[PDB]
Design a protein around this ligand. Structure first.
Ligand SMILES: [Mg+2]
Lengths: 228, 319, 187, 228, 228
DNA sequence: TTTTTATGTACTCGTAGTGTCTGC
DNA sequence: GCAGACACTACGAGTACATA
């Protein structure tokens, strides 16, 4: 079972969410942060043919990078993960499934309260502006009938009132008003086009970024407001 | 006239004063904070007190609310050198169009590891004193470097005079009655609130926390009074056994402190030190040290502690 | 310099910060430091004068206090009393006992031991390192070599052991900069 | 206020002189070092329609490069700077005027004591050899007929008498001698063809370089002989 | 002496094995670890014209780094050494030969019991894999007719049973089965192609990596089994 | 007024060194 | 593209603590 460049980049991105991943047989990988602030799934091309839990995903991907892209990954007779190369064989340890904080089932996202779309260029420039203006918070809200992501710097502006960035996403035809706050430290999405679904019910809330391959559910901040 | 944060649910966080008039500060401290707010500009202040819950963070936020300051709240442990060079300089250098005074509240900034970070701040004030003012709330004043104390106005909390102690205890009893009438808690005995205030003074946060803890059923009766005023875990039984030379009581109590030997010995020495003659002080410390040194050698630790009790009760002469 | 003849006369800190010259800002912020306050000598002296004091917020070291007080025999019966049994007592109780027990006296002076040298301690340390013998045997070797007359030859042999980080072992004060030249050429 | 790429490059160079800049309404940008050891001025194609002080010029220009070159710069209703893109609005803070050291008036340069010229190739060569040979100071002198520029090293040569580099600008005709010493940590030239004017009255002096875009004035060290 | 870039890099590598080294007259330099678990030698192009013992090879190379490569190194009139290069003349002490630990005799490696080769890319892969997998011991053994390096983590595997890396070095074509356990801390070789000569007899044995520049003789671990 | 133990361990912070990715 | 920018790592200074 080879891991292509795209699957390896996807798993490298997943390693920034959870340090280790319990990846099961099939073409589906999902991960959840240890504190449960950001969940992610992906339907990937390379078929996985054995259940294994990796306690250190970043190290596993580094070891994979050490050998060529033609390396054949399998389950060794010992039980570990045997990466076979032209002349080298590497036995990455398999973790106990209970020591890797992973979802038991893919969480079924509810019907979205507000649906919009953020393009790859817009997401890239939002991240770059975040690096530049030092904003660590965003708020997806409604302004003059359009859904806007407002980038605030929470460190100097605790009340989230001084808007440092403002990106218009698309038209909002609904009649509800909301302000879904998302920590930018929770936006661990790989660059791409994301359909942004947002769901809220009382104190419950989430924001799903549906990508072409990977979907990222992100937990809203505690001081989010809405009327859904 | 009480301040309620409907968002919060911890009782000691729900009712946090939003203004200086609402606080339970001493007469002098409340007067100087009122003068600071009336003047309109906060100087560099260091609100410090070893006792937690005196009101330092409350007073800082209340000042920045009273003067309508452009408060920037910082966890002090996050005010590292990059924070001083980064967000802090960005905040001080930005333009205040509204005329609101820029105030940087560096809460709990008494960490020693941030020694270097403080030096820069001391340099920082020399370059951005006009732009922004700095309030540093701290517990261990020795953790703030001396130059910062020299530059800032140091205000010590939690050491009120006897008249101030009486007045603030009365004010805290009144505020706890208001809190109880606001939380739907019926006060059966009015002495329970006074006991709560007296026991936890000057820690007002602990006072509200104990009020919430003991108001489980919504009634504060004489049973609550017995619970508050009678401190379980103290050595009063052991102390009265020692003064009475109660052989039976000491013999019965010796296995009760068998597991927690070291802490009990420390507490016992600390308590007795203030209630004996100086010569008795030397003698008692000698016996306690000699017994504690052989803690890992003697076989029966319970009989060891009984021996300790016998010696302490015997060789001691209370003042 | 300063092409502009009006200016506003910014101090060192304003020039350093407004220019974002973090080397100059670090230099200006280093101008406070103030390593001082001699916490120890106001405990021992207090013990020698029975003056009221509190160390709850302070830092107390039983070894240094006992060694300092041992220099004065008048207080030493107390020190010995804490040398056997004070190991288990808390720092607060240790100070309290030393307060209650040690008699008052106008006692001051310098610790009784070898009065440094930085010319003899280095020789002893170097001989101990080269010959793999203890400090006492190193003193014996140095005393023998001084009398025998072979010491300069030995120093010429093992002057190479003196290096950048070795001198820090000898002493903590900033004088080792001279030591590098002291044995620069024993010849 | 749409800033062209040339203006952004010029301001990026100015950011090496002073971290911030007080750019005022018009077509004139000046900036100065906080110690006054150097100064610049420039006339730009774009016209500035509002007065604003920028605390961090390099960051602001990075944000400008982070959006399209058509982006409309103005002043928002709160006093900060608003950079409007197709969908994204960036709000750059405006600094307190007292925290940026900028000159109130352009320095009126008197009649130059000497006038020469320096070519872009010679300037680039001088910077290159200074970087290679660790030449932290340069000087100009008059030999028997011509003007020459040499380099020294104050780190190792306290008397400034050993020559590590040399260059000849042209032939000087006159009756007065001078050895003007410029610290090399002042050469913010943005290399090009520069008309080099030099003035000195007593125990003081200044060296102006006029370019096709911007002019740069550099202070001279106190230990310089004027001989005028 | 003149110390070229290659010889300086070789000496920097030798400085890891031993703190100092006695440079003896000739084109050959050698050193051994203080405890004697590894030995190194080299035939450098540069010619040494005088015996000198350096107590701090790291400090000597640090002094030589900032000074030009063509610097002449000789012995001073007073027994020390001097490095002279045009503008610089830096004096370095020369310790007593008996102070620093060197083998005092070039060890003649006996005829190898088994000779193989490890490529530069294979050795580098072994080193990076050892870093990534926390491998601390390797074992050169015979597996199915080939000679393989099996990397084990001795900390978690006291008896070296769980193989974590396996690198085939080439066909054996012999008749003796061995398992030479080499600590990875004893392998101080620089990257390059190496001829690996494993010698064993009774309870004695060693492994010599012969490179194009330097030869490193390392000692096998205690429980190395063989039948030579 | 009044010098500053030695060894081992753990944490935090600041900075310099090194390695890798990359955008007008 | 590759100088420049970002991320990871090791080391030193400082602190705190236990033990003898
Ligand atoms: Mg606080």
């Amino acid at each position: 079972m080879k891991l292509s460049k795209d699957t390896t980049a996807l798993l490298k991105n997943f390693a920034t969410i959870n340090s280790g991943i319990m990846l099961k047989s099939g073409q589906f990988i999902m991960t959840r942060a240890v504190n449960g602030t950001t969940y992610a799934e992906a339907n990937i091309s390379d078929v996985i043919d054995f259940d294994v839990a990796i306690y250190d995903l970043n190290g596993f991907l580094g070891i994979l990078s050490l050998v060529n892209d033609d390396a054949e990954i399998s389950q060794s007779e010992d039980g570990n993960i045997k990466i076979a190369d032209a002349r080298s064989t590497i036995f990455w340890p398999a973790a106990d499934p209970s020591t890797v904080v992973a979802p038991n089932k893919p969480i079924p996202f509810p019907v979205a309260s507000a649906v919009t779309e953020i393009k790859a260029e817009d997401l890239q420039q939002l991240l770059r502006v975040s690096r530049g203006l030092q904003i660590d918070t965003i708020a997806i809200t409604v302004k003059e009938g359009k859904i806007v992501i407002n980038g605030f710097n929470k460190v100097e502006d605790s009340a989230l009132t001084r808007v440092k960035y403002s990106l218009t996403l698309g038209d909002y035809d609904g009649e509800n008003t909301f302000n879904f706050i998302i920590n930018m430290a929770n936006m661990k999405m790989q660059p791409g086009n994301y359909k942004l679904l947002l769901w809220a019910k009382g104190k419950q809330g989430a924001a799903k970024f549906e990508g072409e391959h990977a979907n990222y559910v992100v937990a809203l901040e505690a001081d989010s407001t809405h009327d859904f | 006239m009480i301040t309620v944060n409907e968002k919060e649910h911890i009782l000691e966080q729900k009712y946090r004063p939003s203004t200086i008039d609402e606080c339970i500060l001493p007469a002098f401290d409340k007067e100087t904070f009122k003068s600071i707010t009336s003047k309109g500009k906060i100087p560099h202040i260091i609100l410090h007190s070893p006792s937690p819950g005196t009101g330092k963070t409350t007073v800082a936020k209340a000042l920045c609310h009273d003067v309508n300051a452009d408060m920037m709240f910082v966890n002090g442990s996050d005010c590292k050198i990059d924070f001083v060079r980064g967000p802090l300089t960005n905040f001080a250098s930005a333009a205040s169009f509204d005329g609101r005074q820029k105030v940087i509240v560096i809460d709990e900034f008494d960490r020693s590891g941030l020694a270097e970070s403080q030096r820069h701040l001391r340099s920082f004030m020399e370059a951005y004193s006009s732009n922004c003012s700095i309030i540093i709330t701290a517990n261990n004043i020795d953790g703030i470097i001396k130059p910062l104390q020299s530059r800032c106005r140091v205000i010590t909390f939690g050491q009120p005079t006897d008249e101030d102690k009486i007045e603030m205890m009365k004010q805290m009893i009144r505020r706890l009655t208001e809190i109880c009438k606001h939380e739907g808690i019926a006060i059966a005995d009015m002495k329970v609130v006074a006991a709560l205030v007296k026991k936890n003074f000057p820690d007002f946060r602990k006072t509200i926390g104990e009020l919430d803890s003991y108001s489980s059923k919504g009634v504060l009766d004489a049973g609550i009074l017995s619970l508050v005023t009678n401190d379980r875990g103290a050595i009063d039984d052991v102390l009265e056994s020692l003064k009475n030379k109660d052989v039976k009581q000491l013999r019965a109590l010796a296995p009760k402190y068998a597991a927690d030997y070291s802490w009990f010995v420390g507490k016992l020495a600390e308590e007795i030190y203030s209630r004996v003659t100086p010569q008795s002080i030397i003698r008692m410390y000698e016996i306690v040290g000699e017994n504690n040194q052989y803690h890992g050698i003697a076989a029966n630790t319970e009989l060891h502690l009984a021996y300790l009790f016998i010696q302490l009760a015997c060789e001691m002469q209370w003042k | 310099m300063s092409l502009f003849k009006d200016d506003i006369q910014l101090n060192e800190h304003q020039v350093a910060w407004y220019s974002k010259d973090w080397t100059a800002v670090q230099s200006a912020a280093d101008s406070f430091k103030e390593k001082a306050e001699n916490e120890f000598f106001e405990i021992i002296g207090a013990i020698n004068n029975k003056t009221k004091c509190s160390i709850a917020q302070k830092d107390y070291s039983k070894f240094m206090v006992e060694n300092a007080l041992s220099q004065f025999p008048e207080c030493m019966p107390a020190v010995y009393a804490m040398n056997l049994i004070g190991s288990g007592l808390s720092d607060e109780a240790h100070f309290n006992y030393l307060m209650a027990a040690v008699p008052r006296g106008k006692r001051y002076g310098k610790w009784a031991k070898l009065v440094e040298d930085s010319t003899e301690v280095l020789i002893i340390k170097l001989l101990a390192k080269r010959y793999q013998v203890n400090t006492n045997d190193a003193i014996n070797y140095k005393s023998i070599l001084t009398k025998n007359g072979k010491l300069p030859l030995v120093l010429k042999e093992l002057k190479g052991l003196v290096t950048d980080d070795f001198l820090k072992e000898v002493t903590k004060n900033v004088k080792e900069q001279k030591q590098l030249k002291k044995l620069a050429l024993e010849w």
